[PDB]
Amino acid sequence: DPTQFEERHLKFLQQLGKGNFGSVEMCRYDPLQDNTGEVVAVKKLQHSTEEHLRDFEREIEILKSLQHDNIVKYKGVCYSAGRRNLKLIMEYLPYGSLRDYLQKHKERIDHIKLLQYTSQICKGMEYLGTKRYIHRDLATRNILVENENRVKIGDFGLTKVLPQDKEYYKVKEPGESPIFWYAPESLTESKFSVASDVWSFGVVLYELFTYIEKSKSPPAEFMRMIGNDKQGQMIVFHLIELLKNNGRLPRPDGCPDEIYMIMTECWNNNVNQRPSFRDLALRVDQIRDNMAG
Template identity: 35%
Template structure:
């Protein structure tokens, strides 16, 4: 699309269609525009809503959209995929997102994300649009990674979460507190309704039990089970 001088302006996981053979197609061209036959061409809009969490800072500030701003959005799509559908920037307001990005904040690596993939995301999120990779370069990088799976073995240490404390489980005394600490507070009622009312009761919870109670996102399951494993290992330090 970029080679054909199209700027999409709304690249997001919600706009990617996937068939049974895992072939992906970009959809929803409602905001797309054709640019001049110039790699530095930009489309400037005077109004309309902007998907803040997926949009490059210069596009938010000056409403100037380019292929480079689509590259920024592609980096967010990568993050969405690797985090199993997490909401970019979680519960932050749009204004908080804009401020954080301007101050240099970037989304951390999702849980079990290969270092090289997170680095590619960070490259897509360079503040200067000329410093971001071109889509042709991104395709080349991903092709090399596919051909060399060993390069994906090194995982980033960061897990999904904006500012997770180093040992959050040690200071909690209830299931609700624990869920809030690991930023899974939206599942309080699910755990309570399923009878998990004490920290002891969750120590041997399984994936199937999480699924039954409504925790179906794989990324959320992995985050919860990882924390449960920490509770098991450091059980003597937990206030139960």
Template identity: 65%
Template sequence: MEYLPKGCLREYLQKNQERLDHKRLLLYAWQICKGMEYLGSQRYVHRDLASRNILVENETHVKIGDFGLAKLLPQDKEYYVVREPGQSPVFWYAPESLSDNVFSRESDVWSFGVVLYELFTYSNRSQSPSEEFLRMMGRDKPMPIICHLLELLKNDRRLPAPPGCPAEVHSLMLSCWAFSQSKRPKFSELGPKLEALRDSRSKVRG
């Protein structure tokens, strides 16, 4: 993997919040979306899409990184079942990934919705997906975290709209977090919507 000196997107957002407007965030989101669309077209599932795994080349260009959990889909299936043990970034996971270890392009779309959330919170640690969900479930629960998280998602509890986030962007996040896989948009559908939102920001400023 190539070395990109500006590091990961999570830290870049935290350090440069003052000069990253919504138009720039939407550019990053569009680039990530297009990268994921390409991966999907090659039958790859990333399985660990998060701002910590997006690398910043420069102020206007980000790239998807960390393919340690990526898997090629079997020719006869549109999903992949994880059988090996190991730690998982559960707060970025879709319900079917939490309950059945099933990963697909649709579960990557769910994770992309969480990346959108990270972008528009500038990866603020106090608003991170893990912090928000732990607040929702309470920190004194005896059951495993995954059980509580799955219960929250089944009850339609989702990450809140980031402060100042445009309603259209939050609506896209919510569409990515549809409980049913079939109701989530495809990356090929999200890309044009993100581009249109970014163009509309340009016209407002113009």
């Protein structure tokens, strides 16, 4: 519906997050021009191309197909530039990315909250798996915080739909790749699956429990292990060699052994032995529930 969010009633409020190929802004949709309206988040491309706008169309269809408490809410599209461009309209979640929230609001985060966020992320990912969607970019930078009690997967720009007959998607046009969240078979064979999302979730869980101490981020920790001197493809070569022979991110300071064990099971080089997101949500909620109270 091109009349749902008309570009002339979509008012700027704040820049929220930008990268090489996309940007998100806070806007107010005020159809009555009475200084009221709901606040929304607006994603738009950067350095657009025909190929990227086609992908963005796929991204929009993917998000529109998703309705879940732990998936950011799709609201519509703005066909801006006189209906010669595309912008994606989403609900606005006010505490930003989980990566920033962990750093900025340590005062209101304890292990209980971390497990609750863990559970919620797994449940959102269970849901994606029922659509045969592979996220491919799971990281705390792409999780959003609605409030102290709820997080949602917040971006789907790299998400792919599995082929009808395969359980993996083989990417044949790799661009910007978050290699320090990648499963080994994604690095070596460009294969992405629910199981490689589980690998990446293992890194998310690590992130949560490092509390995003800059020296403990996965890129920083892997580069320390690889050698900070290394540059270029040599980094990838050493990362692959490291992972294939059981090199792993360390247990974070203060992390319970049981949570670290979940991490290490997600980081299984044997794809089929990785737990499912349903296993993980149940396991985490049972940890939470087995506590006193």
